[model samples]
Target: SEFEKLRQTGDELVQAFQRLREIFDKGDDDSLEQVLEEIEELIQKHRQLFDNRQEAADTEAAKQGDQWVQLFQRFREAIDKGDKDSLEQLLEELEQALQKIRELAEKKN
Candidate 1:
């Protein structure tokens, strides 16, 4: 039941990523900055969703499953430095992490 909700959050994140890409492509620094803030909020929401789940529901791997959190920090740092290329690379890494998270949510309780 809850996994569906997790998937929903995942969808939001994907959309945010797409929006960021679009803004970046359009060369709109202002809008891109705004979208970055939205992305941060969305990531916070996603993290909270994970927090809502009980720890016992997951295995040991789940404990180390917070790489996305650190990725976001690096994401912010890259954005601060205006490291456009690294932002793209970090987003790719985040997408991979999110994929793993989705797989975890797919497992039966």
Candidate 2:
């Protein structure tokens, strides 16, 4: 029941990854940057999703699962489109994720 919603969200993210990778296959800069921005916005939305999930379920692994969906990585090609650009920013985002997890753990006690 609740998981379906989360699962649906996962499907949408994978689709976003699919689309961004398609564009990256063609144009890797201007267009890809725009897609990056869109995905970045989506990332924020996903954070709110984490908040909502905390109320009902999920120990915030939703965000953990999300680290698996990093935009720079998602929109990529293993051969022709090796992931690049602003990876430092992505690193910071994940740093926050780990910090978030720590906070949750502290709260448990």
Candidate 3:
């Protein structure tokens, strides 16, 4: 949900920046300067949102590192025990979690 919201916000910011660029390209200097100021503010806001999200994610990962390792061990035990259902569930959850992490990591210019 956070990622989705962030992505939407980023898209809106990009659109505004593009509009400003278009105006400048059309030789509308006065309106272009005003839009430039608005664009700068949006850029700063986006940067803060990105930085805060990154820090929060980092903190969460560090806090959960040991728990995740233990879960992995349990999953391995399930595999050795031939508990197919448990193994499958664990694998699916792991896959989804890893995918989310990858998405977060790839969020950049």
Candidate 4:
């Protein structure tokens, strides 16, 4: 029942995002304890959810989507105490990248 499997996987995505919201709000944990907790939880949840999706898709086993895992792990290691400025700048860059992507898409059209 792919329909059923897909429905389950979608819930997994929703829950992971909920976990993400919690992570977003627990800002400025001085000891970096909460940051690691949040990061580890998301990584754990993402690991499981990724597997679920792949399973539902009929793929037996799947790995991370990037070499940036350690980079992200290390980044967040420092980031748990970092300011919001970085993310805001990242958002700006992402928006511009999205614009570029859309431009390319339109060109393809």
| Each prediction's RMSD to truth | 3.1, 9.0, 19.3, 8.1
Which one wins on TM-score?
1
| lDDT (Cα, tens digit) per residue for candidate 2, span 5-100 | 555554565567567657655755667677767767766665565566564346446656565465346444322244345443444554564455
- Please list the residue runs of candidate 2 whose C-alpha ends up more than 4 Å from where it truly belongs after superposition: 1-5, 55-109
Candidate 3 per-residue lDDT over residues 1-109, each given as its tens digit: 3667666666675577567546635756567557656755665665556556665566665544455456556755764576767755765675565455446546533
Q: RMSD in Å for candidate 2, one decimal?
A: 9.0
lDDT per residue (tens digit) for residues 8-93 in model 1: 87888788777877877776778877877887787677767776664544555455445655776787788788898988898688
Look at candidate 4 and tell me the lDDT of residue 83: 54
Q: Rank the candidates by lDDT, best first.
A: 1, 3, 2, 4
Candidate 1 residue 90 C-alpha distance from true site, Å: 0.8
What's the best-to-worst order under TM-score?
Answer: 1, 3, 2, 4
* Residue 22 lDDT, candidate 4, scale 0-100: 57
Q: Estimate each model's TM-score.
A: 0.73, 0.45, 0.46, 0.35
The lowest-lDDT stretch of 10 consecutive residues in candidate 3 is: 100-109
**What is candidate 3's CA lDDT for residue 33?**
55
